[PDB]
Amino acid sequence: FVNQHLCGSHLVEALYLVCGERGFFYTPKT
Amino acid sequence: GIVEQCCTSICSLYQLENYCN
Ligand SMILES: [Co+2]
């Protein structure tokens, strides 16, 4: 796999693909 | 964190895998 430059909604699409069925937590800085 | 790193720098799918449940 290649490295990623991912901002905004593009990151949660990547998380979705990686994790699939497992689900994920999206936890940005405040 | 991961969110910021992927955006300001780069990140791998393997790093992202750490946020799976
Ligand atoms: Co865009």
JSON list of C-alpha atoms and ligand atoms in Angstrom, two decimals:
[
{"chain": "A", "resi": 1, "resn": "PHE", "atom": "CA", "xyz": [0.00, 0.00, 0.00]},
{"chain": "A", "resi": 2, "resn": "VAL", "atom": "CA", "xyz": [1.05, 3.60, -0.59]},
{"chain": "A", "resi": 3, "resn": "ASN", "atom": "CA", "xyz": [1.12, 6.49, 1.93]},
{"chain": "A", "resi": 4, "resn": "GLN", "atom": "CA", "xyz": [-1.75, 8.88, 2.09]},
{"chain": "A", "resi": 5, "resn": "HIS", "atom": "CA", "xyz": [-2.42, 12.56, 2.14]},
{"chain": "A", "resi": 6, "resn": "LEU", "atom": "CA", "xyz": [-5.96, 12.79, 3.54]},
{"chain": "A", "resi": 7, "resn": "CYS", "atom": "CA", "xyz": [-7.99, 15.76, 4.76]},
{"chain": "A", "resi": 8, "resn": "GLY", "atom": "CA", "xyz": [-11.53, 16.15, 5.88]},
{"chain": "A", "resi": 9, "resn": "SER", "atom": "CA", "xyz": [-14.06, 13.66, 4.60]},
{"chain": "A", "resi": 10, "resn": "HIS", "atom": "CA", "xyz": [-11.34, 11.87, 2.59]},
{"chain": "A", "resi": 11, "resn": "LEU", "atom": "CA", "xyz": [-9.87, 10.63, 5.87]},
{"chain": "A", "resi": 12, "resn": "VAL", "atom": "CA", "xyz": [-13.14, 9.06, 7.09]},
{"chain": "A", "resi": 13, "resn": "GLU", "atom": "CA", "xyz": [-13.58, 7.36, 3.69]},
{"chain": "A", "resi": 14, "resn": "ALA", "atom": "CA", "xyz": [-10.11, 5.84, 4.17]},
{"chain": "A", "resi": 15, "resn": "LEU", "atom": "CA", "xyz": [-10.99, 4.76, 7.71]},
{"chain": "A", "resi": 16, "resn": "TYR", "atom": "CA", "xyz": [-14.18, 3.18, 6.42]},
{"chain": "A", "resi": 17, "resn": "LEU", "atom": "CA", "xyz": [-12.24, 1.17, 3.78]},
{"chain": "A", "resi": 18, "resn": "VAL", "atom": "CA", "xyz": [-9.51, 0.08, 6.12]},
{"chain": "A", "resi": 19, "resn": "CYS", "atom": "CA", "xyz": [-11.72, -1.00, 8.99]},
{"chain": "A", "resi": 20, "resn": "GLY", "atom": "CA", "xyz": [-14.79, -2.27, 7.28]},
{"chain": "A", "resi": 21, "resn": "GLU", "atom": "CA", "xyz": [-16.98, -4.38, 9.52]},
{"chain": "A", "resi": 22, "resn": "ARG", "atom": "CA", "xyz": [-14.78, -3.57, 12.53]},
{"chain": "A", "resi": 23, "resn": "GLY", "atom": "CA", "xyz": [-15.91, 0.08, 12.57]},
{"chain": "A", "resi": 24, "resn": "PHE", "atom": "CA", "xyz": [-13.75, 2.92, 13.73]},
{"chain": "A", "resi": 25, "resn": "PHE", "atom": "CA", "xyz": [-13.41, 6.01, 15.84]},
{"chain": "A", "resi": 26, "resn": "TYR", "atom": "CA", "xyz": [-12.88, 9.38, 14.19]},
{"chain": "A", "resi": 27, "resn": "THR", "atom": "CA", "xyz": [-11.07, 11.52, 16.74]},
{"chain": "A", "resi": 28, "resn": "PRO", "atom": "CA", "xyz": [-9.79, 14.90, 15.54]},
{"chain": "A", "resi": 29, "resn": "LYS", "atom": "CA", "xyz": [-8.05, 17.50, 17.65]},
{"chain": "A", "resi": 30, "resn": "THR", "atom": "CA", "xyz": [-10.12, 20.18, 19.29]},
{"chain": "B", "resi": 1, "resn": "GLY", "atom": "CA", "xyz": [-3.09, 13.21, 16.15]},
{"chain": "B", "resi": 2, "resn": "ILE", "atom": "CA", "xyz": [-3.91, 10.87, 13.19]},
{"chain": "B", "resi": 3, "resn": "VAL", "atom": "CA", "xyz": [-6.50, 13.14, 11.79]},
{"chain": "B", "resi": 4, "resn": "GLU", "atom": "CA", "xyz": [-4.02, 16.02, 11.66]},
{"chain": "B", "resi": 5, "resn": "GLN", "atom": "CA", "xyz": [-1.04, 14.02, 10.59]},
{"chain": "B", "resi": 6, "resn": "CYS", "atom": "CA", "xyz": [-2.79, 12.51, 7.53]},
{"chain": "B", "resi": 7, "resn": "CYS", "atom": "CA", "xyz": [-3.74, 16.04, 6.49]},
{"chain": "B", "resi": 8, "resn": "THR", "atom": "CA", "xyz": [-0.63, 18.16, 7.20]},
{"chain": "B", "resi": 9, "resn": "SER", "atom": "CA", "xyz": [1.88, 15.41, 6.50]},
{"chain": "B", "resi": 10, "resn": "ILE", "atom": "CA", "xyz": [1.14, 11.85, 5.27]},
{"chain": "B", "resi": 11, "resn": "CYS", "atom": "CA", "xyz": [-0.03, 8.65, 6.94]},
{"chain": "B", "resi": 12, "resn": "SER", "atom": "CA", "xyz": [-0.22, 4.96, 6.12]},
{"chain": "B", "resi": 13, "resn": "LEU", "atom": "CA", "xyz": [-3.14, 2.53, 6.05]},
{"chain": "B", "resi": 14, "resn": "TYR", "atom": "CA", "xyz": [-1.33, 0.68, 8.83]},
{"chain": "B", "resi": 15, "resn": "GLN", "atom": "CA", "xyz": [-1.46, 3.82, 11.01]},
{"chain": "B", "resi": 16, "resn": "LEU", "atom": "CA", "xyz": [-5.13, 4.17, 10.22]},
{"chain": "B", "resi": 17, "resn": "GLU", "atom": "CA", "xyz": [-5.74, 0.57, 11.24]},
{"chain": "B", "resi": 18, "resn": "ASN", "atom": "CA", "xyz": [-5.01, 1.69, 14.85]},
{"chain": "B", "resi": 19, "resn": "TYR", "atom": "CA", "xyz": [-8.41, 3.53, 14.86]},
{"chain": "B", "resi": 20, "resn": "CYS", "atom": "CA", "xyz": [-10.47, 0.47, 14.01]},
{"chain": "B", "resi": 21, "resn": "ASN", "atom": "CA", "xyz": [-12.77, -1.07, 16.64]},
{"chain": "C", "resi": 1, "resn": "CO", "atom": "CO", "xyz": [-11.87, 16.88, -1.59]}
]
